[PDB]
Amino acid sequence: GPHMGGSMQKVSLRVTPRLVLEVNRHNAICVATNVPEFYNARGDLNIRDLRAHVKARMISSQFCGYVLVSLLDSEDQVDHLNIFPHVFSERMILYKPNNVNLMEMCALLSMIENAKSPSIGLCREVLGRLTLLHSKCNNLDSLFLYNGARTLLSTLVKYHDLEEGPWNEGLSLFKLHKELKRAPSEARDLMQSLFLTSGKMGCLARSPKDYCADLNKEEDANSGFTFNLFYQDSLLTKHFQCQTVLQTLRRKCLGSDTVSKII
């Protein structure tokens, strides 16, 4: 809570890294992509191929870092963001740590967010790998990334009823989002309007990829840059439908400001 003497103990201001994608550039093209599914049908994690992927990224001439945004739990309304655009822009960074272990933690965050059908086995495997990686870094960035991944995993475990523990409560508004679906209709609609339909970041697009294509068309005739986005629709990637999010993503992925430390 915000530590206000007890009345707001369920209001969470916890900061979690979100919307994590790999950014690559060559020629005048820039692409933001989710990390691939380095696991089998049972959710056994393919550490060998994951590690090889991250090592390839660190030495690649195309790799620009991981794009991510730090969001407060109360800002994250599943498919709407309660945050002003100028605040959101400052929260989004292009992160390129010179450390394979921190890069692997970022890759796992992307994998968590983009998992289509996560299982409890996958969530436990990923958590175990993150615990090991954090134990090898033991710095403030790895703590932030470990805590964030645990929060996101916990959100999936709760939302999808994967446990019939190491989990926290997850993002608080995801719990409300699930619970309201079964509330009586009039109360459901009012509480969704009150607590889960922020307008501060504007309208949502049916097709993020077509919206990004239209952003490219504006400068096509003048040989402008091309930006494209690839991600997997899931509980944790709904914010890529926000048009202002996509405009900010495009600007940040094409911009020059890379940081090597988060905290």
Residue numbers in the entry: 10 to 173, 179 to 277
Excerpt from the publication:
BBRF2 is an EBV tegument protein that has putative homologues in all three herpesvirus subfamilies. Here, we report crystal structures of BBRF2 alone and in complex with BSRF1. BBRF2 binds EBV capsid protein MCP and capsid-associated protein BPLF1, whereas BSRF1 associates with EBV glycoproteins gB and gH/gL. These data elucidate the molecular basis of the functional association between BBRF2 and BSRF1, suggesting a role of BBRF2-BSRF1 in tethering EBV nucleocapsids to the Golgi membrane during secondary envelopment.
As crystallization of full-length BBRF2 was not successful, we modified the construct and determined the structure of an N- terminally truncated version with deletion of residues 1−16 (BBRF2Δ) at 1.6 Å. The phases were obtained by single anomalous diffraction using selenomethionine (SeMet) derivative, and the final model was refined to an Rfree of 0.189. ΒΒRF2Δ is monomeric both in solution and in the asymmetric unit of the crystal. BBRF2 has a compact globular architecture that represents a novel fold different from other known protein structures. Arg27 on the bulged loop between β1 and β2 forms salt bridges with Asp85 and Glu122, two highly conserved residues within herpesviruses. Glu122 further stabilizes the conformation of the bulged loop through two hydrogen bonds with the main chain nitrogen atoms of Leu28 and Val29, and Asp85 forms a salt bridge with His253 from η1. In addition, these residues and two deeply buried water molecules establish a comprehensive hydrogen bonding network with Asn123 and ambient main chain atoms. All of these interactions contribute to a prominent hydrophilic core at the center of BBRF2. According to the Dali server, the fold of BBRF2 does not resemble that of any existing protein structure. Thus, BBRF2 represents a novel protein domain, and we named it herpesvirus tegument fold 1 (HTF1).
